């Protein structure tokens, strides 16, 4: 039977991959970083509170200039804030209020939105009429949009619950590339600093590293016992961190093709909603359903700090490109900037 | 006051934006949001037509009350990842077709459609996001149920049934079986209505159930209850 032979062959390849990975386990990360000085307790304060959303905040994204911010709430609004003054620069009403993601273009000209309508809407922020207009609507996903990231001004990448990712050419509105291989819903995306690779985590408890141009899956990383909800790249682009519903974060290395470290505690049993690194990459910030955020020592796996101040689930995290501040948004309707 | 002219202009713009946001929130707080659920071709569409590929929204007004109905069918993705986005809905309208007792799923002929409907109902009502959300149950296609019970007893799907092959008893038995799935009887209420392809009291029934839900919530928020 061809099928038996194929299944057996698959198992042989999986065993070969496992053995090749195990052969590269010379020494754990925790043994190498045993002699590193601990960062110490990290204490941060709330500098700003951003009020105005009247429902749960589901996503936010920092502008590349480290000052402007976009947040999305299911009260039907996308708000662009000035974080230094707390002024609301823009308030964009959405045709569909079931938004679950938003993005800020690197040039700052465009914003992206999406959610349960299966559509990625592109809004132009700098027009001659003085308004914000829907410059485009990308359709073609058969499930909800979970994450989007502007790869450029004319290209965007999206992930949805139909188990696939898509690279879209905004000008023509068509989908240029499709990334298939996940067996569950794709929950999060993280572009590489050089933008030539991206990583995605799915509800099948796995992460995949995709090559943008080729349209091929480069690598598959496993180890989480539940859904992966958040994912982020290490600042130098050679490793990433994933958070799941099993109440743990994990750090995976691209070149070793394995998992370097696990970030877990006995007092934490809720899921992880968001993860991001600090500029150096030394600290790993993760938001939880416990209503707060933990700051971990990425190189030693010790809890370095706690950010508390939200009355409901912390849904989204961000760190500015200049490293000055963190932003947290939760289901309590507030965004808070910390430093 | 330490601000330049342009900074004051920007602050005034922010104040106008806040004013607009408050007005929109006030308008939205007065709307009654309903979540429509059903097991595929269960008469849901007939309910929609009578009362009026992602989420679909219907808007209608009865007696000065604005209802927004969200149909979340045609989303063949995991439900647990987006169900929590409907946590604040006033009520869940659940549609069940009474003829399914004599039918099986096309994808699985060994599974009875009524059992699938009961499983979906049980999952929805006992879900952790909807502990206090009431359910309005619409048992559609009652006419066709009266024309088949006399020939196809409920023992086909309900072996323990020991009643007559009359609609009056079979309908009550089915309503009991569906209300036995509620394990939170101290927090949520279930409203049941028998309807058919030619019924006009469907909107009035929804109005009454939603009014009861709203008044009970107000009382619970004011004490008393």
């Amino acid at each position, epitope marked *: 039977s061809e099928l038996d032979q194929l299944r057996q062959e698959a198992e042989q390849l999986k065993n070969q991959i496992r053995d090749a990975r195990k052969a590269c386990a010379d020494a754990t990360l925790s043994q190498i970083t045993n002699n590193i000085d601990p960062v110490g307790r990290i204490q941060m304060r709330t500098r700003r509170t951003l009020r105005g959303h009247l429902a749960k905040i589901y996503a936010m994204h920092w502008g590349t200039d480290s*000052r402007l911010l976009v947040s999305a709430s299911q009260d039907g609004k996308l708000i662009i804030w000035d974080s230094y003054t707390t002024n609301k*620069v823009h308030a964009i009403p959405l045709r569909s209020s079931w938004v679950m993601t938003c993005a800020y273009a690197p040039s700052g000209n465009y914003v992206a939105c999406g959610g349960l309508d299966n559509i990625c809407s592109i809004y132009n922020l700098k027009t001659r*009429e003085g308004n914000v207009r829907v410059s485009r609507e990308l359709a073609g996903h058969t499930g909800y949009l979970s994450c989007c990231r502007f790869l450029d001004d004319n290209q965007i990448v999206t992930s949805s619950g139909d188990t696939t990712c898509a690279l879209w050419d905004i000008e023509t509105g068509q989908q240029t590339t499709t990334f298939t291989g996940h067996t569950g819903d794709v929950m999060s995306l993280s572009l590489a600093p050089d933008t030539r690779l991206f990583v995605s985590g799915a509800c099948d408890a796995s992460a995949k590293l995709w090559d943008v141009r080729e349209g091929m899956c480069r690598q598959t990383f496993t180890g989480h016992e539940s859904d992966i909800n958040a994912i982020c790249f290490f600042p130098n682009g050679n490793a990433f961190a994933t958070g799941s519903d099993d109440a743990t974060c994990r750090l995976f290395d691209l070149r070793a093709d394995q998992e370097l470290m696990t970030y877990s505690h006995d007092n934490i049993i809720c899921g992880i909603t968001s993860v991001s690194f600090s500029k150096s990459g030394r600290l790993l910030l993760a938001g939880y359903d416990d209503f707060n955020c933990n700051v971990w020592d990425a190189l030693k796996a010790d809890r370095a700090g706690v950010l508390a101040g939200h009355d409901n689930r912390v849904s989204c995290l961000g760190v500015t490109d200049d490293g000055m501040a963190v932003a947290t948004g939760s289901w309590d309707s507030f965004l808070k900037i910390w430093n | 006051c330490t601000l330049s002219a342009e900074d004051k202009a920007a602050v005034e713009r922010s104040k106008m934006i806040d004013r607009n946001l408050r007005e929109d929130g006030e308008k939205a707080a007065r709307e009654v949001k309903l979540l429509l659920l059903g097991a595929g071709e269960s008469g849901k569409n007939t309910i929609v037509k009578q009362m009026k590929t992602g989420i679909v929204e219907t808007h209608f007004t009865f007696k000065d009350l604005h209802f927004k109905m969200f149909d979340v069918g045609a989303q063949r993705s995991e439900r647990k990842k987006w169900i929590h986005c409907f946590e604040g809905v006033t009520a869940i309208i659940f549609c069940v077709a009474l003829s399914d007792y004599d039918l099986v799923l096309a994808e699985d002929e060994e599974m009875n459609r009524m059992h699938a409907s009961m499983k979906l109902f049980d999952s929805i009502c006992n879900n952790k996001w909807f502990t206090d959300t009431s359910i309005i149950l619409f048992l559609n296609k009652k006419d066709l149920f009266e024309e088949k019970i006399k020939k196809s007893p409920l023992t086909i799907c309900y072996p323990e049934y020991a009643g007559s092959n009359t609609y009056e008893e079979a309908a009550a038995y089915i309503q009991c079986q569906f209300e036995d799935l509620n394990k939170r009887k101290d927090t949520k209420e279930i409203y049941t209505h028998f309807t058919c392809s030619t019924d006009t009291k469907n909107v009035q029934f929804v109005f009454d159930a939603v009014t009861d839900v709203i008044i009970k919530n107000n009382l619970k928020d004011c004490g008393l209850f």
Partner: single-chain antibody
Amino acid sequence: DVQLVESGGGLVQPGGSRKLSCSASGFAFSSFGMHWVRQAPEKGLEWVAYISSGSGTIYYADTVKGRFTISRDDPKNTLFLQMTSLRSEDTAMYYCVRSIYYYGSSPFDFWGQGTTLTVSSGSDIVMTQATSSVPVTPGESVSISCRSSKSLLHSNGNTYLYWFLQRPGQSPQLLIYRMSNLASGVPDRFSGSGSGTAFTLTISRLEAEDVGVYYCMQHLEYPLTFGAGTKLEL
């Protein structure tokens, strides 16, 4: 297409009253604040009045305060200036200017065409442009200087200096909206720099289309003040 059309000018007797109107088309009129700026036959620009979006804040230049009233009609997309007790010094061409203020915006980015109104019979910042005219040749670079009596650098880091250009027989047009910020649609050959109280506008590869009068404005505090205007020739 963005369009501002002004009407209501003409000849009026001293002591009379005329109403000027500015009809707007092709943009979100209610989101913009509006200015009325005049240019007497002396070709120097004078800011007259300002009404914000939402009509919350209204400012007048002292020379006209108590005689002019500025108002808006958002549903009809029209701006109004009510002028009473007219004096010969009110003869001028009046321009309707739109300006929108938020972080990173570009104020004074579109000017109207103007209405010619003819009448028969201390703490303000002073902006100086020493050179009135400069003979120039195509293909060569030119430098235009502006001086301020008070530093235009604010504690927030912005230098509120605006450069405008007016070609023969046309409305002024924005070139640099904040020291070193080129305006939308402006050729890259124009560049600006400065410090505190001394500012420079540099033009590279001069073109025949770049001949006109260059104006310097400060937006640090009301009333808004313009320069005398530097003229390019040949």
